[PDB]
Design a protein around this ligand. Structure first.
Ligand SMILES: Nc1ncnc2c1ncn2[C@@H]1O[C@H](COP(=O)(O)O)[C@@H](O)[C@H]1O
Ligand SMILES: Nc1ncnc2c1ncn2[C@@H]1O[C@H](COP(=O)(O)O)[C@@H](O)[C@H]1O
Ligand SMILES: [Mg+2]
Ligand SMILES: [Mg+2]
Ligand SMILES: [Mg+2]
Ligand SMILES: [Mg+2]
Ligand SMILES: [Mg+2]
Ligand SMILES: [Mg+2]
Ligand SMILES: [Mg+2]
Ligand SMILES: [Mg+2]
Ligand SMILES: [Mg+2]
Lengths: 218, 220
RNA sequence: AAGGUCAUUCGCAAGAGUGGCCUUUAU
RNA sequence: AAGGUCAUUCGCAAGAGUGGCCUUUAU
């Protein structure tokens, strides 16, 4: 069933045991799993994306490119690129959902696989990667489909205005001990908002988005 | 130019000298044409070189084993060590300021991005050039335990397994001009205490943590 | 890495670098 | 990313994955 991936990919392995290893979670083999390929793949793809950014972005200033990169090398973004490859259909895994973290790990492991299989031909792998995703990446940027970091955007707003940082405090924690929903207040001066999520961080991001919003209505 | 000497050490001659010059130029010297963007590309480029090397020659290729190696091998400190081979500091163009380890580590990244660009974005070629200069020295530093230790992390792993607790760090003193400050910090776990000195809290906590680890290996 | 802040340098301002601190994001 | 820990799964132990929390490092 690797052949469907090999077509979506447009590459055929000279060693299918590499491709297999890259699609295989440890809960299906503690002998041959994506972990190591995931390590190389992260470095290899971060490089692809950054290289891409320096090529096409007119504003080449590190203060501009950086927060772009923080998004385009993120698990959240890798999962989107994986959707083009229907990556979840090829993942050797037993007990556990194929959640965003697994998908992203495989996506990293995959490109490591291609790289090594091509004989560590980074030039080839890079262009193959660009063949698949360059237009998708560049279009996300152009159309503003880049996830905003509201906590950082907020704090930079309030530090310029009041030389202070907002306060996030925990309001409630409810649900089964791994299906928890957090509710968090975010406050600056006397402006107060709420957020809810499945991590303390996620709820703080929501509240902070509301707070940015609230400060603009005023 | 003088660039011929660097080019010699490097084993590569630039087609575009301006490209080389930009990688060696701080913004204090030229707000128009300096190393910042190259530095950005280089960080990703060089990290990859390091990582691919680690995966290639290491028997233990576990995530949680390689990552701490990587964490030292892609650090400003370690890049300053590689820079020495090129004598990078005598080529850097900088105006009102010393050429500290941050500048050198920055230029080390930029220079590699510059070779990369100047080669027509040939990553295979650039990676082999890096290796020619640096592969043996890198592998040998790993082999010979010349890898800097993350004491604060080592220590909290020690105290957590033994006592299910993290050491406590408290500020004892600060000394000097707000831009040339010297910190003294205490690390504590149970009744064991050590002191540490540094030019930043983190560096002092690091020295404190190291001594505490030593203390714990005498009694525990 | 980014923002604020203390120091310092570019005569002050604006803007920038470097050093410290605090905080925040991504990997 | 690592360690501790809560939850959960692999029948328990051992080991490992996933989700939460806390802490630490590197870029
Ligand atoms: N918080 C962190 N501290 C140290 N290294 C990290 C951290 N996050 C990511 N890394 C490094 O980046 C590699 C790839 O990360 P990842 O894509 O999240 O699996 C890891 O194996 C580590 O070497
Ligand atoms: N703490 C950080 N938060 C976010 N991005 C970072 C951080 N440290 C390094 N980076 C990213 O890595 C790039 C290279 O870092 P550097 O080698 O320190 O100049 C930066 O330009 C950022 O894109
Ligand atoms: Mg990654
Ligand atoms: Mg992981
Ligand atoms: Mg990863
Ligand atoms: Mg928190
Ligand atoms: Mg770097
Ligand atoms: Mg850098
Ligand atoms: Mg910098
Ligand atoms: Mg900075
Ligand atoms: Mg982990």
């Amino acid at each position: 069933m690797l052949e469907q991936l090999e077509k979506k990919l447009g590459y055929t392995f000279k060693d299918k045991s590499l491709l297999e290893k890259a699609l295989t979670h440890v809960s299906y083999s503690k002998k041959e799993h994506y972990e190591t390929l995931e390590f190389l793949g992260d470095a290899l793809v971060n490089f692809f994306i950054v290289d891409l950014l320096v090529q096409y972005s007119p504003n080449k200033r590190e203060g501009f490119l950086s927060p772009l990169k923080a998004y385009l090398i993120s698990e959240e973004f890798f999962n989107l690129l994986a959707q083009k490859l229907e990556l979840h259909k090829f993942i050797r895994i037993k007990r556990g959902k194929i959640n965003e973290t697994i998908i992203g790990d495989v996506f990293e492991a995959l490109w490591a696989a291609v790289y090594i299989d091509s004989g560590r031909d980074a030039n080839f792998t890079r262009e193959l990667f660009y063949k698949l995703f360059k237009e998708d990446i560049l279009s996300a940027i152009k159309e503003g489909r880049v996830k905003k970091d509201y906590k950082t955007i907020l704090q930079e707003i309030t530090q310029k205005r009041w030389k202070e940082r907002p306060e996030y405090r925990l309001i409630s924690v409810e649900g089964p001990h791994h299906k928890k929903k957090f509710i968090v207040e975010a406050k600056i001066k006397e402006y107060r908002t709420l957020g809810e999520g499945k991590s303390k961080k996620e709820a703080e991001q929501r509240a902070a988005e509301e707070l940015i919003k609230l400060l603009e209505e005023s």
